[PDB]
Write an enzyme that holds these catalytic residues in place. Structure first.
Site, PDB file in Angstrom:
ATOM      1  N   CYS A 256       0.862  -1.211   0.000  1.00  0.00           N
ATOM      2  CA  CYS A 256       0.000   0.000   0.000  1.00  0.00           C
ATOM      3  C   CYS A 256       0.887   1.246   0.000  1.00  0.00           C
ATOM      4  O   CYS A 256       1.441   1.527  -1.046  1.00  0.00           O
ATOM      5  CB  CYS A 256      -1.016   0.009   1.137  1.00  0.00           C
TER       6      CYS A 256
ATOM      7  N   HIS B 283      -3.065  -5.676   1.134  1.00  0.00           N
ATOM      8  CA  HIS B 283      -2.338  -6.202   2.325  1.00  0.00           C
ATOM      9  C   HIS B 283      -2.325  -7.725   2.337  1.00  0.00           C
ATOM     10  O   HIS B 283      -3.244  -8.344   2.888  1.00  0.00           O
ATOM     11  CB  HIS B 283      -2.984  -5.702   3.623  1.00  0.00           C
TER      12      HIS B 283
ATOM     13  N   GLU C  23      -0.610  -9.544   4.287  1.00  0.00           N
ATOM     14  CA  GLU C  23      -0.364  -9.961   5.695  1.00  0.00           C
ATOM     15  C   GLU C  23      -1.698 -10.178   6.427  1.00  0.00           C
ATOM     16  O   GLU C  23      -1.672 -10.862   7.466  1.00  0.00           O
ATOM     17  CB  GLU C  23       0.521  -8.961   6.450  1.00  0.00           C
TER      18      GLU C  23
END
Length: 185
Positions: A76, A160, A162
């Site tokens: 991002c 994202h 993660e």
């Protein structure tokens, strides 16, 4: 060891916790961390530039994106910072709020379907991809959901990986780590 530049976002500890999930060791350092400090530690085999609310407080990542000899994944804000660093263009994008986004893989995505749901904000986006880069993925509302440098081991994702909300998130992180010399048995 992977090094995570903390650009101030809510999901930086999550990066460390997902890399752990796939058995990759990582540590968070402030984003003012000079490139020389990071590369003097010969255990560091890759760099992640995290998400963050303000591009003007993460200027040092531009230096890292241009000059590092290690592989880089931008997430991002970090994706936007890689774009800026090679002379691409960034601008206000389509919608600020984190939401599930369908991503189309246009070419990182080993063992990942052509379409998959990713956790993404669109406050900002890469408007112009820099020289030496190519788009890897897109969404309905975002032309550049992922990109990589054609010859340098440098990758960016608007979304994202993660965050569990991202399907194949750990697979995307694991594909990056393979570029960083990590073995998965």
């Amino acid at each position: 060891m992977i090094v995570i530049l903390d650009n101030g976002g809510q999901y930086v500890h999550r990066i460390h916790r997902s890399l752990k999930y796939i058995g990759v060791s990582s540590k968070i350092v402030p984003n003012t961390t000079p490139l020389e400090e990071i590369e003097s530690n010969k255990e560091v085999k890759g760099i992640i530039l995290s998400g963050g609310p303000d591009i003007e407080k993460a200027k040092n990542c531009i230096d890292i994106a241009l000059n590092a000899k290690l592989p880089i994944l931008g997430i991002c804000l970090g994706h936007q910072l890689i774009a800026l660093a090679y002379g691409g263009e960034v601008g206000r994008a389509e919608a600020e709020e984190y939401a599930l986004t369908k991503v189309y893989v246009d070419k990182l995505f080993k063992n990942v379907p052509r379409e998959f749901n990713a956790w993404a904000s669109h406050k900002d986006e890469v408007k112009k991809v820099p020289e030496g880069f190519e788009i890897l993925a897109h969404s309905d509302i975002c032309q550049v959901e992922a990109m990589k440098h054609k010859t340098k081991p440098i990758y960016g994702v608007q979304f994202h990986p993660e965050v569990a909300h991202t399907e194949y998130g750990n697979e995307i992180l694991k594909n990056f780590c393979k570029v960083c010399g990590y073995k998965f048995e």
